[PDB]
Amino acid sequence: NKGCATCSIGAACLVDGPIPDFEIAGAXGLXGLWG
């Protein structure tokens, strides 16, 4: 959806590898995953 534009980036901490820890910096991406 055009609503979740404030965080079109996407949810990805990367803490599941390099170990940067919940490095999302914009979970808004979820707003787009649905619309």
Curated annotation (Swiss-Prot):
Covalent cross-link Cyclopeptide (Asn-Gly) as placed by the record, residue numbers: 1-35
| Triggers of expression | Transcription is highly induced by oxygen limitation and is under dual and independent control of Spo0A-AbrB and ResDE.
Q: Which GO terms describe its cellular component?
A: extracellular region
Q: Please provide the record's keywords in A-Z order.
A: Antibiotic, Antimicrobial, Bacteriocin, D-amino acid, Secreted, Thioether bond
Upon changing residue 7 to A, the result is: In vitro can no longer make the Cys-thioether cross-link, variable loss of the other 2 thioether cross-links, in vivo no cyclopeptide formed
Leader sequence range is none
**Sequence position, cross-link 2-cysteinyl-D-phenylalanine (Cys-Phe):** 4-31
As annotated, the 2-cysteinyl-D-allo-threonine (Cys-Thr) covalent link is placed at 7-28
Task: Answer whether the UniProt record assigns the keyword Secreted to this protein.
Answer: yes
- Known consequence of changing residue 22 to S? In vivo forms 2 thioether cross-links, no cyclopeptide formed
User: Subcellular localization, per the record?
Assistant: Secreted
* Consequence when changing residue 13 to A: In vitro no longer makes the second thioether cross-link, in vivo no cyclopeptide formed
| A GO biological-process term | defense response to bacterium
Q: How is it modified after translation?
A: Propeptide cleavage and cyclopeptide formation only occur after all 3 thioether cross-links are formed.
Q: Where is this cross-link: 2-cysteinyl-L-phenylalanine (Cys-Phe)?
A: 13-22
- Taking the first listed entry, what is the main subcellular location of this protein, grouped into a coarse class? secreted
This protein's source sits in the domain of life called Bacteria
UniProt function note: Has bacteriocidal activity against some Gram-positive bacteria such as Listeria, some species of Bacillus and E.faecium. A single mutation (Thr-14-Ile) confers hemolytic activity against rabbit and human blood.
Family in the record: Belongs to the bacteriocin class V family.
Record protein name field: Subtilosin-A
The species this protein was found in:
Bacillus subtilis (strain 168)
Gene symbol here is sboA
Of the parent protein, the shown chain spans 9 to 43 of 43
